[PDB]
Each structure stands twice: as structure tokens, then as C-alpha cells.
Paper text:
Dimethylsulfoxonium propionate (DMSOP) is a recently identified and abundant marine organosulfur compound with roles in oxidative stress protection, global carbon and sulfur cycling and, as shown here, potentially in osmotolerance. Microbial DMSOP cleavage yields dimethyl sulfoxide, a ubiquitous marine metabolite, and acrylate, but the enzymes responsible, and their environmental importance, were unknown. Here we report DMSOP cleavage mechanisms in diverse heterotrophic bacteria, fungi and phototrophic algae not previously known to have this activity, and highlight the unappreciated importance of this process in marine sediment environments. These diverse organisms, including Roseobacter, SAR11 bacteria and Emiliania huxleyi, utilized their dimethylsulfoniopropionate lyase ‘Ddd’ or ‘Alma’ enzymes to cleave DMSOP via similar catalytic mechanisms to those for dimethylsulfoniopropionate. Like dddY, cloned dddL, dddQ, dddW, dddK and dddU conferred DMSOP lyase activity even with equimolar DMSP present, which was not surprising considering the similar structures of DMSP and DMSOP, and that these DMSP lyases have cupin domains and similar catalytic mechanisms.
Residues His56, His58, Glu62, His96 and the DMSOP molecule coordinated the Mn2+. In addition to the coordination bond between Mn2+ and DMSOP, a hydrogen bond between Tyr122 and DMSOP helped locate the carboxyl group of DMSOP in the DddK active site, potentially explaining why the Tyr122 substitution reduced DMSOP lyase activity by >90%. The positively charged dimethylsulfoxonium moiety of DMSOP was located exactly where DMSP was in the DddK–DMSP complex and was stabilized via cation–π interactions to the side chains of several aromatic residues, including Tyr21, Trp26, Phe108, Trp110 and Phe117, which, except for Tyr21, also perfectly superposed onto the DddK–DMSP complex. The Tyr21 side chain moved ~1 Å away from DMSOP compared with that of DMSP, providing a wider substrate-binding pocket to accommodate the DMSOP dimethylsulfoxonium moiety, which is larger than the sulfonium of DMSP. Structural analysis also highlighted Tyr64 and Tyr122 as the probable DddK DMSOP cleavage catalytic residues, although the distance between the Tyr64 hydroxyl and the C-alpha of DMSOP was >4 Å. From these data, we proposed that the DddK catalytic mechanism for DMSOP mirrored that for DMSP29. When DMSOP binds to DddK, it displaces the water molecule and forms a new coordination bond with Mn2+. Subsequently, the catalytic residue Tyr64 attacks the Cα–H proton of DMSOP, forming a Cα carbanion. Then, the Cα carbanion attacks the Cβ of DMSOP, leading to the breaking of the Cβ–S bond. Consequently, DMSOP is cleaved into DMSO and acrylate, which is then released from the DddK active site.
Residue numbers in the entry:
A (entry chain B), B (entry chain A): 1 to 126
């Protein structure tokens, strides 16, 4: 199994979102629930201006690849700005958040060492 | 740990290359041999015009995130063009290759579900 995905390829998948996290939306691009892939899973997320992926944690390690815009990464209390061209490593169960305070949409891929997103349990930090 | 890394952040690290992959060079941005991260590892690769990452396989699944240029992905014998904005899933042990026959550099990140790149044993294929 080898395959290529982009936003055009997942046009017929609806965006995921929740009232719990205003301004945040996501799609699944490499994911066992859609593709039968395994070992790694990847999604594409957008954070609108003012949106906040609030402080949370989850057991798998995570990489984010920032593809557009800029934001403020909350590294368990220590803030650092991120932007297009950055990659982010987040250790498993490390508390992190991401806020968009710019003009552009903050867009990024996330990657988990899991077969799929839906088996990752998200916990709010507080 | 949580950290951020971009090409500028690894200026200190010389490009890696190998004779078997002409016109291919890479750096390690998230890697236990460099960072003490764990669970996922990520590098950045450039394939110069004419360069060829020849047909090979390795046991871990792999994701590629194409950030610039165009390339010809060999999917175990079936070709597909990839370009900026694409992501690629390569199942563990699936045979794959990536050629650049364009005029601009083909740039991508790769991600493995390993702590470090040196945990990935590469095998040549057909
Ligand atoms: C934008 S998502 C799909 O909630 C996942 C983002 C994250 O885990 O940091
Ligand atoms: C650029 S590398 C790390 O030599 C090979 C990348 C790959 O496994 O496809
Ligand atoms: Mn997260
Ligand atoms: Mn490979």
C-alpha cells in the first residue's frame, strides 16, 4: 500500500470540528479508518484567527508540520512562536496548546505513531 | 520535551548523503540521536534536479510531506507524480523510489514511527 493525498483528494470528506474548539477544523489524510494504512497517521488542521487549540495531552508523541501562517505554541507553560516552515515535536503526554494570533489561517499537518486518529484519547489539561 | 525546528535551526548540521542516491541530501530535525525525542522521527530531504532516490524498502511505515518541487514517485511499480502540497503514505516494506526530473529542487519531510533514523534499515529492491 502506497498512496498520495492532498486537499483535492479529500474534497468529499467533510471537515471535522466541534463547538468545543471554536475556529478549529480538520480532515484525515492518512488514517486507518479511511485508508487501511497503519503505523503512522496524519491529518490536516486549520486554526482560524483567534482560534485556540487549548492546553491538552495524549499518550502518543506528535509531530506538527506548519504549512501556513503563524501561531503561539504553548510548551507546557513556555511559549514559542511557530510559523510556516517549522516542525514541532511534542513528547507523549506533554501538555501543549496552539493559538493563532495572525492574519492568515494557521494550517498544519499533525502526525501520530498510531494507525488512526480515532483511537487517540485527548485529555484537557484543566 | 517539546521543541521547534526549522532548516535555519540546523545550520550547524552538515548535509548527509550517500553514493547510492545521486543528487539526494538530507538533515535530521527530530531524531533521538540528536534530540532525545522518541516515538516519531523526522528529516528533511532535497532531491536536486536529476536526482534519484532509487527503489528500496524498510520495515517501518513512512510518511512524506512534499513542500516544494515535483517528483516521480515509484509506488512498487506504478508511477505517480507528486508535488508541493502532497503527503505520501508508504506501508512498511513496500518498495518505493522518488525521482526528480524537473528543474527545481524537490523538497520533502519524511517521518518514521521510530525514535531515530538509525533504527531504519534500508534494503535495495528490483
Ligand atoms: C487539530 S486536531 C485533529 O484536534 C489534533 C491537533 C493536536 O493533537 O495537537
Ligand atoms: C532522504 S533518506 C532518509 O535518505 C530516504 C527517505 C525515504 O526513506 O524515503
Ligand atoms: Mn496534540
Ligand atoms: Mn523510504
Amino acid at each position: 500500500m502506497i498512496f498520495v493525498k492532498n486537499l483535492a483528494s479529500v474534497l468529499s470528506q467533510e471537515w471535522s470540528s466541534t463547538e468545543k474548539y471554536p475556529g478549529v477544523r480538520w480532515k484525515f489524510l492518512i488514517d486507518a479508518d479511511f485508508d487501511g494504512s497503519s503505523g503512522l497517521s496524519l491529518g490536516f488542521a486549520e486554526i482560524a484567527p483567534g482560534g485556540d487549540l487549548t492546553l491538552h495531552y495524549h499518550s502518543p508523541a506528535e509531530i506538527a508540520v506548519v504549512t501556513n501562517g503563524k501561531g503561539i505554541l504553548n510548551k507546557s507553560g513556555k511559549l514559542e512562536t511557530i510559523k510556516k516552515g517549522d516542525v514541532v515535536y511534542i513528547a507523549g503526554n506533554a501538555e501543549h496548546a496552539l493559538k493563532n494570533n495572525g492574519k492568515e489561517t494557521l494550517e498544519f499537518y499533525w502526525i501520530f505513531p498510531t494507525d488512526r486518529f480515532s483511537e487517540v484519547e485527548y485529555f484537557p489539561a484543566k
